Design a binder for this molecule. Structure first.
Ligand SMILES: [Zn+2]
Length: 30
């Protein structure tokens, strides 16, 4: 039940918890 990127679709590992509004993305997916 891992957080998938709100843009690409892949799991956002705890390494790459991008801070948008309220959820998780990756670096280039911000
Ligand atoms: Zn992504």
């Amino acid at each position: 039940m891992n957080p998938n990127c709100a843009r690409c679709g892949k799991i956002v590992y705890p390494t790459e918890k991008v801070n948008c509004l309220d959820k998780f993305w990756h670096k280039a997916c911000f």
